Each structure stands twice: as structure tokens, then as C-alpha cells.
Design a protein around this ligand. Structure first.
Ligand SMILES: Cc1cc2nc3c(=O)[nH]c(=O)nc-3n(C[C@H](O)[C@H](O)[C@H](O)COP(=O)(O)OP(=O)(O)OC[C@H]3O[C@@H](n4cnc5c(N)ncnc54)[C@H](O)[C@@H]3O)c2cc1C
Ligand SMILES: Cc1cc2nc3c(=O)[nH]c(=O)nc-3n(C[C@H](O)[C@H](O)[C@H](O)COP(=O)(O)OP(=O)(O)OC[C@H]3O[C@@H](n4cnc5c(N)ncnc54)[C@H](O)[C@@H]3O)c2cc1C
Ligand SMILES: O=C(O)c1csc(Cl)c1
Ligand SMILES: O=C(O)c1csc(Cl)c1
Lengths: 340, 340
């Protein structure tokens, strides 16, 4: 059983690890290989701040709400483990500001100590008059991806830097199961009109006095098109750009100005914070995560393919639930091959 | 009117600043000088982490409860000012862990978003089964003291490195009002059996993933004789020593081992944190702050004194309320001398 996972993002690496950990003993000819065009720190996961928060609206597939929750419970179960520093995982509390009262989220009980903001807290933010306060977790992509890489290397999963042109080229080379974790670039292997790039731009700033995240929201401009401030381990992430259909992997000046003055008005202590870096990424936007199987008509034989892409701006938030679910789909392929 | 403030800690400097801004134009020859044996970074204020939190019990003088709220309200009114970085001031949420249920503190409504810990939050700390969660402030003494100095220097308040032997010495030099802010060393100028050193020791550790403060409590050990973890701007403070009657300004190895084992058990991610420094300070312990006027019998005519010391382990928590109050008693001196 030769398995080829395409993608070295949080989706591909966690899926490869979760498949190996659940199926190493039931299948000894289990050679897992990871094909990827870019690795850390050159993936979309590296650009993400790493905060655990799903979208405010319910996810159009209630199974995604569970995948988000079991990812949170799994990460929280190791947030006080001594290796949490290596994963880039830690607790963080913060605010979610609004201009008008909105209903509570579906993940209010997943989060620790969810509550609505008191008047004295709202007075620190004059432009907003309603919001939440809650304790969540941050999984920084740079540390988490390298942690997954080393653990996959411990389990004998070889890595190869190459751009896959088609599923058939991997199938014809001997692959039995192809795990499609290509993210926003998935359409290049199979056209999907529902998948489109949600381009974002973030600023990484040195402001170590920031102990809380601050996410603002405006339904007119869309989600994450509003200033947000997310403190990480060594730096503070400033963002607020979300552009559909923009393929320009290049830092914009106007977006830089939008991010800066939006967060500076939100928190005036940032005016003296030095800018360390700035990055551009593409959220794999889709109305639904494509986590499903597909038997490919490739050749006289037929290839088995597992898709998992289209996680939008919540990939790290939902990655572990998607990895477990992709491992279950891998097990059904096993039972149908007279193999489990 | 020649005023002499003895003490360059948070109590001496804030009182000298609060006195001048209220009386520099009501009083034309207002020459204020600061006499101090040690300045920053060699004062007890520099050892403190800077967390705003009073004792758990009522302060035996309900005016101190007001002084603490005045300090919180004033600091909170400057937490989003762009010069808060110069003050070393920023918001921070955190935990207060207990082994079983105890009554709520009197300052519950002063802090932001006070609440009790949920069961899932208590599961992250296996030893403690009850606790609180609230948002507070941190005023790092080093940045705050150098800020107060720069203010006072701009206003013609000259500083002098000098050990004061007696009030009579200062009054001999021509001083009209003496503001005694000598902290734990006040007994060397007037014997006070109520003032004793609450020696403490803290560890400054590099663990920037710590976003919350964690204070543990044990009624058997006494307050602050239990592990606490207070993340600062550039470092994380680890403490938990409160020893009455020890004047040894020397870091102890057993106290070091007590702090390390207590905080590492409380937070296993601290196992690999770099130790940056270690400090020892003396809390000016008193059953109540001595904030009062005293006309003492030196020379053929009196020279009046204002005492401000005995703040224990909540000096930065209460400094501003005591500074305003010491300015009021300075104003009554102006009335008794018919100067206003
Ligand atoms: C600015 C910004 C901030 C974000 N913040 C958060 C956040 O705070 N929390 C959160 O949960 N999410 C956040 N996200 C979203 C998150 O980054 C993504 O959902 C997540 O990274 C998706 O990763 P992925 O594994 O699907 O693909 P990405 O990590 O891009 O990885 C794609 C992988 O597929 C590979 N690949 C693609 N095509 C081929 C090919 N043809 N041949 C070989 N390899 C190929 C790529 O090279 C790479 O290996 C943010 C996104 C952006 C843009
Ligand atoms: C380990 C530790 C942690 C702490 N943490 C906190 C905390 O988190 N939050 C909080 O609110 N408080 C905390 N405290 C308490 C806080 O540090 C003190 O309450 C506060 O610093 C009081 O300082 P002060 O101004 O009274 O005098 P200190 O800063 O000592 O300053 C005394 C000044 O008076 C001078 N002086 C004394 N005698 C003479 C003299 N005879 N002649 C000339 N000058 C003299 C001293 O040299 C110095 O200039 C902590 C204390 C310790 C020890
Ligand atoms: O996509 C984003 O910009 C984003 C900000 S917080 C979060 Cl979770 C995701
Ligand atoms: O005295 C202390 O060690 C102390 C710890 S938190 C706080 Cl406020 C004071």
C-alpha cells in the first residue's frame, strides 16, 4: 500500500501523520510519501497567525463544527504538555468587537469562559459598542509544521519537493491512495469553480506588551476585512485584508496602510511598535470543505483519491478534525480492498 | 516653600510629581528636591513585577481600598495612550488558583470582567479546584520610575544621591516640609515596631508564550508564599517567597529551588525557559499604610513631616491613591501657614 500525500501545509502534514499513526500496525507495506511544491516557511499555513476561531456564521455543514471542536479539545489536551513550546501552542484570551449586537457563536461552549463584554471593557474601544471576551488557543504554523515534519520523519515518511501536474502522473508511478491537500491550488489538478483564493495580508510587529487578541468585525465588508491584532510568541500579527479572487502573491502598499491605521486606531500603543515583517497568503475559500473520496477512472485500473482542501481562513482551527476524518475515509478504502 | 522628598521609589516619585502638579502655580517658590540612597534600577520597586492586585482580605483601613481603585481607574484611563509603553503599562488577564472555595475579594468590581473559573479551566491545574478569572493591569516599576523621573526633571525637581540620617538633619538644611517615603527603611529615621521587611525573591524568565498571570494561594503558607507567574513586557516573573523579618538582600538557593519547582509544576512549559535574572526585595510590611502628617519637635520651631510608607506587597497597586492623599495633607499645611 503506497500512499502519496500532496501538500506540506497543516492539512497535508497532519493528515499524513494521522493516517500513519492509525494505520501503521494494520498495514506493514505502508509507504507514505509527501509530494509538495513549497514547504515551511513558504506555505499559507506559515502566514497564518494561528488563532483558533471558526467563522461567526454556522459552517454550512454541521460536521465542520465538530471537526473544529475536536481540534480544540485535542490542542487543549496538550497545551500544558512540555512539548507545547515546540508545537507553537499556548493559551490566549481576547476580544471580539462589533458595532451592533449579534447572536452568540456556535462555538461558545468549545471556548473556555465565553462571555459578553462589560461596559467598562467596551469604553476602551470607542468605535465599537458590543462584543465578546473569551479564552482560546494559538497554534503558530511555523513551529507546528516543523513539529509535524520531524515526527513524520521519525515514522519514515519521505519528503519530496516537486509540483504535481496531474493525479494520473502520481497514479501511473505506483500510488494506490492519493491524498489531495493542495489547498487553494487544488483547481490545477481538478477544476473546481467553488474554490477561489481569499487573499490576505498581515503585518508582524514587535509589541510584546500586547497580551490579548482583538478581532473587530463588520458584516458590510466581510469577515477578516476588519482590523485584528493577534499576539504570537515573538511578534504581534496585524491584519484585516480579505480579497476574493486576488492571486497576487505580493505585499500591497494600500493594504499595508489599511492594516496599519486600522490597528493603530484600535490600539494607539502600536504607533511606536517596529514592523518586523509582512506576508501575503491565499485562504482556500469554498462554501464547504471538500473532505471526500473519489475513485479515479485513471487507466484500466482505477485510482483512489482522498480530497481535503478548502479550509478558508480556519485551516489551523479545524485541521485535526479533518485529519481524523480523512483517516476514517482511508480505513473504508482498506475494508473495500480486502485489506482490514 | 522648600519641600524635600526622601525616597526615589514609586511612592516617593509619584508623591513628588502629584504634589508639584497641584501646587506649582498656587505656590511660586516651590523648590522640590528628591533625596534618595538608591535610585532605579536598585530600588524595591524595580524588583516588583507590577501587577495590580491588593490582598485578598480587607485592608484594616477601608480608605486603602479606595486608594487602590483610584490607582486602577487612573492607570486604566492611560492604558491605550501611546505613551503607555514608556510607563510600562498594559492590560493582562490571568488566574487566581485556590485549593477550595473562598469568598470573593472586595476589589472584584474594580477589575474588568471578574468571574469564577469553569470546570474545564480548573482541569488545566490539577492541584487547585477553585479560582477566579479577571483582567487587570501591570505597571513595570523600571519603566515607570524612569518615566516619573523624566517628568520630574522637566519640572525642575533636582535629584541627589544621599543617605538621610535624621529628619533634624534635613530640617537643619532649610527644609519646610519633609515627605518621608523611605519604604521598608523608615525605621532608621523613626522607630516603628509595626514596620518589618517582608523579604521576597523573584525569577525573571524568558517565556514569551505566557500571556496570562497565574497566582496560587494557600492559607497555611501565607499570601505570596505560593507560586505565581507574572508575564512582563520582555520577561516572565516567577516568585512565591514572603519571609517576614529577613534583611538578607541576597538571592537564596533554596528560595530559588522553591520558586522553580513550584512554577514548573504549576506550568510545565516553563521547564525549558531561559533564566535571565534573579532579584531580592523587601516589602515594607505594616498592618496599615502610615499616610499621615506629624509635627515633630526639632529646633525652637517645628518642621512638619508627611509619612508615606508601609505599602507591603501592593505599593504599585496603591501608589497613586496615596500620592493624591499625600498631596491633600500637603494642601492643609498650606492652609495652616496661610499660604493660599
Ligand atoms: C492571512 C491569513 C491569516 C490566517 N490566519 C488563520 C488563523 O489565525 N487561524 C486559522 O485557523 N487559519 C488561518 N488562516 C487560514 C490558514 O492559513 C489556511 O486555511 C491553511 O493554511 C490551509 O493550509 P493547507 O494545508 O490547506 O494549504 P497551505 O498551507 O497552502 O498548503 C498548501 C500545500 O499544498 C501544496 N501544493 C499545492 N499544489 C501542489 C502541487 N500541484 N504539487 C505539489 N504540491 C502542491 C503547497 O505547495 C503546499 O504544500 C489564515 C490565512 C491567511 C491567509
Ligand atoms: C518580590 C516583590 C514583588 C512585588 N510585586 C509587587 C507587585 O506585583 N505589585 C505591587 O503593587 N507591589 C509589588 N511589590 C511591592 C512593591 O515593590 C513595594 O510595595 C513598592 O516598591 C514600595 O516601594 P517604596 O516607594 O515604598 O520604596 P522602595 O522602592 O524601596 O523605595 C525606597 C526609596 O526610599 C529610599 N530611602 C530609604 N531610606 C532612605 C534614607 N534613609 N535616605 C535616603 N533615601 C532613603 C530608598 O533608597 C529608595 O530610594 C513587590 C515587592 C517585592 C519584594
Ligand atoms: O484569515 C484571517 O485573516 C484570520 C484572522 S484570525 C483567524 Cl482564526 C483567521
Ligand atoms: O509581593 C508579591 O510578591 C506580589 C506578587 S503579585 C503582587 Cl500584586 C505582589
Amino acid at each position: 500500500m503506497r500512499v502519496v500525500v500532496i501538500g506540506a501545509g497543516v492539512i497535508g502534514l497532519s493528515t499524513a501523520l494521522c493516517i500513519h499513526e492509525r494505520y501503521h500496525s494494520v498495514l506493514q507495506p505502508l509507504d507514505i510519501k509527501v509530494y509538495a511544491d513549497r514547504f515551511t516557511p513558504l506555505t499559507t499555513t506559515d502566514v497564518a497567525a494561528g488563532l483558533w476561531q471558526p467563522y461567526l456564521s454556522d459552517p454550512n455543514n454541521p460536521q465542520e463544527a465538530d471537526w473544529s471542536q475536536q481540534t480544540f479539545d485535542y490542542l487543549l489536551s496538550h497545551v500544558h504538555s512540555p512539548n507545547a513550546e515546540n508545537l507553537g501552542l499556548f493559551l490566549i484570551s481576547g476580544y471580539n468587537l462589533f458595532h451592533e449586537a449579534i447572536p452568540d457563536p456556535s462555538w461558545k461552549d468549545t471556548v473556555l469562559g465565553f462571555r459578553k463584554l462589560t461596559p467598562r471593557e467596551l469604553d476602551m474601544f470607542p468605535d465599537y459598542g458590543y462584543g465578546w471576551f473569551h479564552t482560546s488557543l494559538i497554534l503558530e504554523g511555523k513551529n507546528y509544521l516543523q513539529w509535524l515534519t520531524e515526527r513524520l520523519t521519525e515514522r519514515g515518511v519521505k519528503f519530496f519537493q516537486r509540483k504535481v501536474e496531474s493525479f494520473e502522473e502520481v497514479a501511473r508511478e505506483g500510488a494506490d491512495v492519493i491524498v489531495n491537500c493542495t489547498g487553494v491550488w487544488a483547481g490545477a489538478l481538478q477544476r473546481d469553480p467553488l474554490l477561489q483564493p481569499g487573499r490576505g495580508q498581515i503585518m508582524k510587529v514587535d509589541a510584546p506588551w500586547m497580551k490579548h487578541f482583538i478581532l473587530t468585525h463588520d458584516p458590510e465588508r466581510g469577515i477578516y476585512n476588519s482590523p485584528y491584532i493577534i499576539p504570537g510568541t515573538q511578534t504581534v500579527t496585524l491584519g484585516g485584508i480579505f480579497q476574493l479572487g486576488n492571486w497576487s502573491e505580493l505585499n500591497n502598499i494600500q493594504d499595508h496602510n489599511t492594516i496599519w491605521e486600522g490597528c493603530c486606531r484600535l490600539e494607539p500603543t502600536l504607533k511606536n511598535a517596529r514592523i518586523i515583517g509582512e506576508r501575503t497568503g491565499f485562504r482556500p475559500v469554498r462554501p464547504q470543505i471538500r473532505l471526500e473520496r473519489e475513485q479515479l477512472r485513471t487507466g484500466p485500473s482505477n485510482t483512489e483519491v482522498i480530497h481535503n482542501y478548502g479550509h478558508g481562513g480556519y485551516g489551523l482551527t479545524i485541521h485535526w478534525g479533518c485529519a481524523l476524518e480523512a483517516a476514517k475515509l482511508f480505513g473504508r478504502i482498506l475494508e473495500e480492498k480486502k485489506l482490514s
